[PDB]
Amino acid sequence: TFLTTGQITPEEFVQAGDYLCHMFPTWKWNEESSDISYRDFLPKNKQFLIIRKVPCDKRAEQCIDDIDELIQDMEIKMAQERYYDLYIAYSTSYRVPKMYIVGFNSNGSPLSPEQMFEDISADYRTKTATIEKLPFYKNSVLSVSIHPCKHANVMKILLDKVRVVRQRRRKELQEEQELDGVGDWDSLRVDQYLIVFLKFITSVTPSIQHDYT
Template sequence: MDLQNLVNNVKSVSLSVAEKFTPVLKESKFRETGVLTPEEFVTAGDNLVHHCPTWSWARASDPSRVRSFLPENKQYLITRNVPCHKRCRQMEYDQSQEKILTSMEVGAEEGFAGDEDGGWVDTHHYNQETGSSQALELGQEMNEDDDGEEEALDLDDLVESGGLEDPDPNRFVAASNKPTSEVERPRTYDLHICYDKYYQVPRLYLVGYDENRRPLSVEQTYEDFSADHANKTITVESHTSLDCDMPTVHPCKHAEMMKRLLDQYAESGKELGVHEYLLLFLKFVQAVIPTIEYDYTRAIQL
């Protein structure tokens, strides 16, 4: 753990230096490469705030941290007190809950062309307590390779399976019929979405609190992240607008994943506008933090 933290810190410092020499993106390339200009980030953020009033814009902690390429009153997005009723270990695989769906079945249900070969496993199909855990299963695709670099998440199944449109009202809802001793006390999280100038994409930061509103340690926070991402895809780095370090979903593969999602939607006849970018972004990040109930966009049809 200490060695990994050291590596993360070195990477964070290196990227901070590199960002200073990275020019601000001026030309829109979100359809071609999945990246955003600062202006497009603000447009997408305004749309998120409009559809989900739990999100709001925030200012930098002090003038020295104001990023000149963003409006002073729109430095980053924040939502507070997001519930987290379960730890990720409570979503472990149980064969008795799974149902194998063919690609043809999934495609027919979601309106996408199916494939007779292969299929998709809904690991919690018969579990009304958690509903489908497809986001967690997809998150496991984002394992690290031998040199420590992240592999791109294969998102073809995400669109085919309807993972971006979750109609299940039972998903991530804590069961009320369990004895109190079996139910974890709820934690809460404050989530921040910043603009990463180096990678030219949104970056998600998180800070967690226990049931008494005491800040969680880094080790406690990792309990709420998919095991394949804790301390790997999730790193602890300096916040862009605040004088503190926070766990963050590393953005090195964000553009690639967003480009693939945008292409999948375009192929299905649902071309998305740049203002919808953050709605889509929040949905695929659910693979990394499957038990934090931040995605209030599930009812929004993209």
């Protein structure tokens, strides 16, 4: 399972994508366009996820329990202002999702690669972010991609930490029930994979508004 490896199959990528778009209407699957370079192991209308123009107020320089809370809650259900389009695509080399961000200034002018790195937290640059063309377009655009598995298997680490927290919380609860004599009075599914992935993304790009969470 994905909890053991921290990796998913294209089918699991689809479920997670659907869940993400269902819980956060702002996210959407790609439409079917002629300018897209389709991958056969994924339905044509579910190649990648996109969220448009997420605002960025400050640079990165200035700027686990939350995830669990958010996941639980969902189970219940310089000065320049910048805007970033965020793409989540599936990486076949690591069987993990991968994000691509494309920045713009208020006028809609694309920000250069160097400018976008100002929005990547210094603590994640070298082993997480690099410059590359969006891989899903025939005539592509430049962007900064954020990878979760080049060094540390981030998804794996995060999913484990989340389970540890839950196990502790569940046992601490039973212990408090015995202590208070009221003892006589949620698992992680692949659907929530991308939500954990976005938590990771939030640490990597701290100045990007949480309009995707």
